Design a protein around this ligand. Structure first.
Ligand SMILES: CN(C)C(=O)c1cccc(-c2cccc(-n3ncc(C(=O)O)c3C3CC3)c2)c1
Ligand SMILES: [Cl-]
Length: 288
């Protein structure tokens, strides 16, 4: 079976939790802590291994942006450090193409990155690629048809409705149709032929709205809203369904986990995290 892994996050300070949720039986397992607490990180999976990428340790002892890449092996329940990125990237987005990890955007102090870099597990090496056309932190990233999409975020002055696409064989970014909603710190994922953008912050309010981009029609369409307004949510896909994990609603650090069924176009509550938190990294792989 396959589990939904949530790594890190934020409640009062950055967290080192790694916990796994099993959709088949409702259960949560607490597994080995991150070596370094971090919020604003991304999770991804390559070759059955879980990776935690970037973030920031917000701690009473000081605040440190992370250039770290760390690898969790479910077989051993151990974290191993990998090569660090060129730069710290808090509020990062990541996507996997052809067994390589793309690290996109994020912040280092007041630096809002447009830069993008690619990790090759077989060589344990990062290399920079073409930068985005826009500086983006709190950027949503998704992969569809071996193309990489960067969606919304914050450019240092404004939250963004814009999005762009990276064409690996041209090493080139191009704008796509902008979303119907400004979204920073949203959850972005892919399901079937569509990129979904769920929640986020629009500059004024946390959002419950959810819209999806069909690459064949180049248009964004709203689907049913989530039950909870949320920014800095985790999102993943498990068995053809979107799961959104935690985030912040303007009032509470949510423990709510909601699940979207695209056939009924409905959201439902499925479980709650063991504790409320925002800014987690999420991905899916085999059980330990
Ligand atoms: C209430 N606290 C501070 C938290 O919940 C929190 C804590 C740590 C980390 C994050 C986080 C994670 C990912 C992205 C972003 N992000 N990136 C950009 C913007 C923006 O406001 O535009 C944001 C905010 C809306 C979520 C933040 C949020
Ligand atoms: Cl932060």
């Amino acid at each position: 079976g396959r589990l939904i892994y949530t790594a890190g996050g934020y409640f009062r300070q950055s967290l080192s939790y790694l916990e796994a949720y099993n959709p088949s039986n409702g259960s949560w397992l607490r597994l080995a802590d991150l070596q370094v607490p971090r919020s604003g990180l991304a999770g991804c999976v390559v070759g059955g291994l879980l990776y935690a990428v970037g973030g920031r340790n917000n701690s009473p002892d000081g605040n440190t942006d992370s250039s770290a890449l760390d690898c969790y092996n479910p077989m051993t329940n151990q974290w191993s450090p990998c090569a660090s990125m060129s730069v710290p990237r808090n509020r990062i987005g990541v996507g996997v193409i052809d067994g390589h990890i793309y690290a996109v955007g994020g912040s280092h102090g007041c630096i809002h990155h447009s830069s993008v870099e690619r990790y090759e597990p077989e060589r344990d090496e990062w290399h920079l690629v073409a930068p985005m056309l826009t500086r983006r932190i709190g950027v949503g990233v998704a992969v569809l048809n071996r193309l990489l999409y960067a969606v919304g975020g914050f450019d240092g002055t404004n939250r963004l409705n814009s999005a762009e696409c990276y064409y690996p064989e041209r090493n080139e970014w191009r704008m796509i149709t902008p979303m119907n909603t400004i979204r920073s710190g949203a959850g972005v994922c892919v399901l079937h032929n569509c990129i979904y953008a769920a929640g986020g912050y629009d500059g004024q309010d946390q959002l419950n709205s959810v819209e999806r981009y069909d690459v064949e029609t180049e248009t964004w369409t709203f689907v049913a809203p989530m039950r909870h307004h949320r920014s800095a949510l985790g999102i993943t896909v498990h068995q053809g369904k979107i799961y959104v994990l935690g985030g912040y609603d303007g009032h509470t650090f949510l423990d709510s986990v909601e699940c979207y069924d695209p056939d009924s176009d409905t959201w439902s509550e499925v479980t709650r995290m063991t504790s409320g938190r925002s800014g987690v990294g999420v991905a899916v792989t085999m059980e330990p």
